[PDB]
mmCIF file of all heavy atoms in Angstrom:
data_model
loop_
_atom_site.group_PDB
_atom_site.id
_atom_site.type_symbol
_atom_site.label_atom_id
_atom_site.label_comp_id
_atom_site.label_asym_id
_atom_site.label_seq_id
_atom_site.Cartn_x
_atom_site.Cartn_y
_atom_site.Cartn_z
ATOM 1 N N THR X 127 76.211 86.432 95.738
ATOM 2 C CA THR X 127 75.527 87.622 96.205
ATOM 3 C C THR X 127 74.521 88.191 95.235
ATOM 4 O O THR X 127 73.923 89.215 95.554
ATOM 5 C CB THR X 127 76.524 88.713 96.646
ATOM 6 O OG1 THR X 127 77.362 88.998 95.525
ATOM 7 C CG2 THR X 127 77.352 88.225 97.763
ATOM 8 N N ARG X 128 74.355 87.565 94.074
ATOM 9 C CA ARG X 128 73.442 88.100 93.052
ATOM 10 C C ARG X 128 72.380 87.095 92.742
ATOM 11 O O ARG X 128 72.668 85.984 92.322
ATOM 12 C CB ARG X 128 74.193 88.458 91.760
ATOM 13 C CG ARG X 128 75.185 89.571 91.988
ATOM 14 C CD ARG X 128 75.912 89.916 90.714
ATOM 15 N NE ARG X 128 76.689 91.119 90.909
ATOM 16 C CZ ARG X 128 77.453 91.679 89.990
ATOM 17 N NH1 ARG X 128 77.595 91.132 88.782
ATOM 18 N NH2 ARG X 128 78.076 92.803 90.297
ATOM 19 N N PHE X 129 71.141 87.495 92.908
ATOM 20 C CA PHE X 129 70.003 86.668 92.495
ATOM 21 C C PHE X 129 69.586 87.101 91.117
ATOM 22 O O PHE X 129 69.274 88.259 90.877
ATOM 23 C CB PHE X 129 68.847 86.838 93.462
ATOM 24 C CG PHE X 129 67.622 86.070 93.096
ATOM 25 C CD1 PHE X 129 67.421 84.787 93.594
ATOM 26 C CD2 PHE X 129 66.659 86.614 92.271
ATOM 27 C CE1 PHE X 129 66.281 84.058 93.272
ATOM 28 C CE2 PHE X 129 65.508 85.902 91.962
ATOM 29 C CZ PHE X 129 65.328 84.621 92.455
ATOM 30 N N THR X 130 69.542 86.149 90.211
ATOM 31 C CA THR X 130 69.230 86.481 88.821
ATOM 32 C C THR X 130 67.821 86.141 88.479
ATOM 33 O O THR X 130 67.376 85.022 88.728
ATOM 34 C CB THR X 130 70.113 85.729 87.865
ATOM 35 O OG1 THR X 130 70.242 84.391 88.371
ATOM 36 C CG2 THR X 130 71.456 86.363 87.899
ATOM 37 N N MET X 131 67.133 87.113 87.876
ATOM 38 C CA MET X 131 65.786 86.946 87.379
ATOM 39 C C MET X 131 65.971 86.727 85.886
ATOM 40 O O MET X 131 66.154 87.694 85.112
ATOM 41 C CB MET X 131 64.942 88.198 87.679
ATOM 42 N N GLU X 132 65.975 85.454 85.493
ATOM 43 C CA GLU X 132 66.285 85.071 84.088
ATOM 44 C C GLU X 132 65.135 85.204 83.106
ATOM 45 O O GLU X 132 65.372 85.259 81.902
ATOM 46 C CB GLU X 132 66.792 83.618 83.997
ATOM 47 N N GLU X 133 63.901 85.190 83.612
ATOM 48 C CA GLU X 133 62.695 85.149 82.772
ATOM 49 C C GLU X 133 61.872 86.398 82.997
ATOM 50 O O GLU X 133 61.772 86.902 84.129
ATOM 51 C CB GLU X 133 61.872 83.910 83.128
ATOM 52 N N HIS X 134 61.283 86.911 81.925
ATOM 53 C CA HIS X 134 60.403 88.074 82.010
ATOM 54 C C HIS X 134 59.020 87.644 82.519
ATOM 55 O O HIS X 134 58.067 87.633 81.768
ATOM 56 C CB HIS X 134 60.313 88.742 80.638
ATOM 57 C CG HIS X 134 59.604 90.065 80.636
ATOM 58 N ND1 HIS X 134 60.283 91.268 80.628
ATOM 59 C CD2 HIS X 134 58.284 90.380 80.600
ATOM 60 C CE1 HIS X 134 59.412 92.265 80.608
ATOM 61 N NE2 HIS X 134 58.192 91.755 80.588
ATOM 62 N N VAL X 135 58.916 87.321 83.806
ATOM 63 C CA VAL X 135 57.644 86.907 84.401
ATOM 64 C C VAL X 135 57.367 87.798 85.618
ATOM 65 O O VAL X 135 58.131 87.788 86.557
ATOM 66 C CB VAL X 135 57.678 85.423 84.825
ATOM 67 N N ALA X 136 56.269 88.554 85.575
ATOM 68 C CA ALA X 136 55.829 89.424 86.670
ATOM 69 C C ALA X 136 55.238 88.566 87.777
ATOM 70 O O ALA X 136 54.538 87.607 87.530
ATOM 71 C CB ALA X 136 54.699 90.303 86.145
ATOM 72 N N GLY X 137 55.474 88.988 89.009
ATOM 73 C CA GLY X 137 54.927 88.288 90.141
ATOM 74 C C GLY X 137 55.805 88.467 91.347
ATOM 75 O O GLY X 137 56.574 89.423 91.455
ATOM 76 N N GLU X 138 55.686 87.521 92.256
ATOM 77 C CA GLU X 138 56.398 87.548 93.526
ATOM 78 C C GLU X 138 57.603 86.628 93.429
ATOM 79 O O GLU X 138 57.471 85.477 93.040
ATOM 80 C CB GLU X 138 55.470 87.113 94.648
ATOM 81 C CG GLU X 138 54.154 87.856 94.643
ATOM 82 C CD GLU X 138 54.307 89.356 94.769
ATOM 83 O OE1 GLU X 138 55.195 89.839 95.514
ATOM 84 O OE2 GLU X 138 53.518 90.059 94.095
ATOM 85 N N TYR X 139 58.776 87.183 93.704
ATOM 86 C CA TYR X 139 60.030 86.436 93.694
ATOM 87 C C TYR X 139 60.560 86.375 95.107
ATOM 88 O O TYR X 139 60.729 87.406 95.738
ATOM 89 C CB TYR X 139 61.064 87.162 92.851
ATOM 90 C CG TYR X 139 60.846 87.036 91.375
ATOM 91 C CD1 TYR X 139 59.814 87.729 90.734
ATOM 92 C CD2 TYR X 139 61.662 86.209 90.606
ATOM 93 C CE1 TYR X 139 59.615 87.623 89.373
ATOM 94 C CE2 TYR X 139 61.483 86.093 89.250
ATOM 95 C CZ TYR X 139 60.457 86.802 88.650
ATOM 96 O OH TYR X 139 60.308 86.637 87.306
ATOM 97 N N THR X 140 60.844 85.182 95.593
ATOM 98 C CA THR X 140 61.403 84.968 96.907
ATOM 99 C C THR X 140 62.885 84.707 96.804
ATOM 100 O O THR X 140 63.306 83.921 95.976
ATOM 101 C CB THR X 140 60.677 83.831 97.638
ATOM 102 O OG1 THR X 140 59.306 84.187 97.799
ATOM 103 C CG2 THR X 140 61.255 83.601 99.015
ATOM 104 N N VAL X 141 63.658 85.338 97.690
ATOM 105 C CA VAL X 141 65.098 85.158 97.743
ATOM 106 C C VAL X 141 65.443 84.805 99.171
ATOM 107 O O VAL X 141 65.094 85.549 100.098
ATOM 108 C CB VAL X 141 65.854 86.427 97.305
ATOM 109 C CG1 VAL X 141 67.347 86.174 97.240
ATOM 110 C CG2 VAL X 141 65.379 86.916 95.939
ATOM 111 N N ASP X 142 66.179 83.724 99.375
ATOM 112 C CA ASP X 142 66.612 83.331 100.699
ATOM 113 C C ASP X 142 68.048 83.787 100.937
ATOM 114 O O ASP X 142 68.943 83.505 100.142
ATOM 115 C CB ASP X 142 66.560 81.811 100.848
ATOM 116 C CG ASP X 142 65.173 81.262 100.848
ATOM 117 O OD1 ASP X 142 64.186 81.978 101.066
ATOM 118 O OD2 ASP X 142 65.079 80.039 100.659
ATOM 119 N N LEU X 143 68.235 84.553 102.006
ATOM 120 C CA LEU X 143 69.485 85.200 102.306
ATOM 121 C C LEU X 143 69.974 84.767 103.670
ATOM 122 O O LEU X 143 69.180 84.557 104.583
ATOM 123 C CB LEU X 143 69.253 86.709 102.354
ATOM 124 C CG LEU X 143 68.795 87.354 101.046
ATOM 125 C CD1 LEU X 143 68.283 88.756 101.318
ATOM 126 C CD2 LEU X 143 69.908 87.371 100.020
ATOM 127 N N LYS X 144 71.285 84.625 103.819
ATOM 128 C CA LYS X 144 71.877 84.352 105.132
ATOM 129 C C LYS X 144 72.298 85.646 105.788
ATOM 130 O O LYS X 144 73.154 86.369 105.265
ATOM 131 C CB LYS X 144 73.074 83.449 105.011
ATOM 132 C CG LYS X 144 72.687 82.016 104.744
ATOM 133 C CD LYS X 144 73.797 81.008 104.936
ATOM 134 C CE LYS X 144 73.281 79.587 104.792
ATOM 135 N NZ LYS X 144 74.443 78.659 104.813
ATOM 136 N N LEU X 145 71.744 85.934 106.953
ATOM 137 C CA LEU X 145 72.224 87.066 107.729
ATOM 138 C C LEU X 145 73.589 86.729 108.317
ATOM 139 O O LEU X 145 73.871 85.579 108.637
ATOM 140 C CB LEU X 145 71.251 87.410 108.836
ATOM 141 C CG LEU X 145 69.892 87.948 108.374
ATOM 142 C CD1 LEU X 145 68.982 88.148 109.560
ATOM 143 C CD2 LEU X 145 70.033 89.251 107.606
ATOM 144 N N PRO X 146 74.445 87.729 108.493
ATOM 145 C CA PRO X 146 75.774 87.445 109.018
ATOM 146 C C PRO X 146 75.720 87.046 110.478
ATOM 147 O O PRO X 146 74.956 87.599 111.273
ATOM 148 C CB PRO X 146 76.531 88.755 108.848
ATOM 149 C CG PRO X 146 75.522 89.769 108.529
ATOM 150 C CD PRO X 146 74.275 89.132 108.090
ATOM 151 N N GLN X 147 76.524 86.084 110.844
ATOM 152 C CA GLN X 147 76.543 85.594 112.228
ATOM 153 C C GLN X 147 77.155 86.659 113.129
ATOM 154 O O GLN X 147 78.158 87.274 112.772
ATOM 155 C CB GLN X 147 77.349 84.302 112.333
ATOM 156 C CG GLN X 147 76.522 83.042 111.967
ATOM 157 C CD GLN X 147 75.498 82.657 113.099
ATOM 158 O OE1 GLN X 147 75.613 83.115 114.240
ATOM 159 N NE2 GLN X 147 74.462 81.918 112.738
ATOM 160 N N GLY X 148 76.570 86.823 114.304
ATOM 161 C CA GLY X 148 77.118 87.751 115.288
ATOM 162 C C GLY X 148 76.771 89.198 115.065
ATOM 163 O O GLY X 148 77.196 90.045 115.831
ATOM 164 N N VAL X 149 75.970 89.489 114.041
ATOM 165 C CA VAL X 149 75.584 90.864 113.768
ATOM 166 C C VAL X 149 74.159 91.112 114.271
ATOM 167 O O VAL X 149 73.229 90.402 113.898
ATOM 168 C CB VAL X 149 75.712 91.165 112.273
ATOM 169 C CG1 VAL X 149 75.131 92.529 111.947
ATOM 170 C CG2 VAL X 149 77.167 91.020 111.844
ATOM 171 N N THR X 150 74.036 92.084 115.163
ATOM 172 C CA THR X 150 72.740 92.467 115.659
ATOM 173 C C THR X 150 72.591 93.976 115.463
ATOM 174 O O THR X 150 73.579 94.701 115.367
ATOM 175 C CB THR X 150 72.562 92.122 117.149
ATOM 176 O OG1 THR X 150 73.573 92.802 117.883
ATOM 177 C CG2 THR X 150 72.651 90.629 117.415
ATOM 178 N N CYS X 151 71.351 94.452 115.391
ATOM 179 C CA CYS X 151 71.112 95.872 115.203
ATOM 180 C C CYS X 151 69.671 96.181 115.584
ATOM 181 O O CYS X 151 68.748 95.447 115.228
ATOM 182 C CB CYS X 151 71.446 96.342 113.760
ATOM 183 S SG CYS X 151 71.058 95.253 112.417
ATOM 184 N N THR X 152 69.488 97.294 116.274
ATOM 185 C CA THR X 152 68.161 97.703 116.694
ATOM 186 C C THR X 152 67.419 98.526 115.640
ATOM 187 O O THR X 152 66.197 98.637 115.702
ATOM 188 C CB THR X 152 68.239 98.491 117.990
ATOM 189 O OG1 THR X 152 69.139 99.588 117.860
ATOM 190 C CG2 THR X 152 68.730 97.609 119.130
ATOM 191 N N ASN X 153 68.145 99.128 114.703
ATOM 192 C CA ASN X 153 67.599 100.058 113.724
ATOM 193 C C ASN X 153 68.255 99.805 112.381
ATOM 194 O O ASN X 153 68.705 100.707 111.686
ATOM 195 C CB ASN X 153 67.782 101.502 114.180
ATOM 196 C CG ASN X 153 67.090 101.813 115.474
ATOM 197 O OD1 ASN X 153 65.893 102.193 115.466
ATOM 198 N ND2 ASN X 153 67.762 101.643 116.552
ATOM 199 N N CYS X 154 68.314 98.539 111.988
ATOM 200 C CA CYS X 154 68.978 98.179 110.776
ATOM 201 C C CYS X 154 68.233 98.700 109.556
ATOM 202 O O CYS X 154 67.019 98.908 109.589
ATOM 203 C CB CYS X 154 69.074 96.652 110.586
ATOM 204 S SG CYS X 154 69.076 95.587 112.003
ATOM 205 N N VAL X 155 68.963 98.835 108.462
ATOM 206 C CA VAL X 155 68.328 99.130 107.178
ATOM 207 C C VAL X 155 68.771 98.054 106.206
ATOM 208 O O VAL X 155 69.980 97.792 106.050
ATOM 209 C CB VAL X 155 68.678 100.542 106.675
ATOM 210 C CG1 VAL X 155 67.819 100.884 105.467
ATOM 211 C CG2 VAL X 155 68.467 101.591 107.775
ATOM 212 N N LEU X 156 67.801 97.442 105.530
ATOM 213 C CA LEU X 156 68.054 96.492 104.457
ATOM 214 C C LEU X 156 67.893 97.198 103.125
ATOM 215 O O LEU X 156 66.844 97.794 102.898
ATOM 216 C CB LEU X 156 67.064 95.332 104.572
ATOM 217 C CG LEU X 156 67.153 94.245 103.534
ATOM 218 C CD1 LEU X 156 68.455 93.464 103.687
ATOM 219 C CD2 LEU X 156 65.973 93.309 103.641
ATOM 220 N N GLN X 157 68.901 97.089 102.247
ATOM 221 C CA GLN X 157 68.874 97.709 100.936
ATOM 222 C C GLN X 157 68.791 96.612 99.881
ATOM 223 O O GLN X 157 69.672 95.773 99.757
ATOM 224 C CB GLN X 157 70.146 98.510 100.698
ATOM 225 C CG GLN X 157 70.207 99.243 99.361
ATOM 226 C CD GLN X 157 71.571 99.731 99.021
ATOM 227 O OE1 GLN X 157 72.514 98.941 98.867
ATOM 228 N NE2 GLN X 157 71.750 101.043 99.007
#
Side-chain angles (χ1 to χ4, degrees), residues 127-130 134 136-157:
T127 58
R128 296 180 171 179
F129 178 92
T130 41
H134 189 100
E138 310 301 323
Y139 285 73
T140 299
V141 186
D142 292 342
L143 297 166
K144 285 194 174 173
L145 293 176
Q147 276 286 343
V149 172
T150 59
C151 38
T152 55
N153 299 272
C154 333
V155 189
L156 179 68
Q157 182 194 62

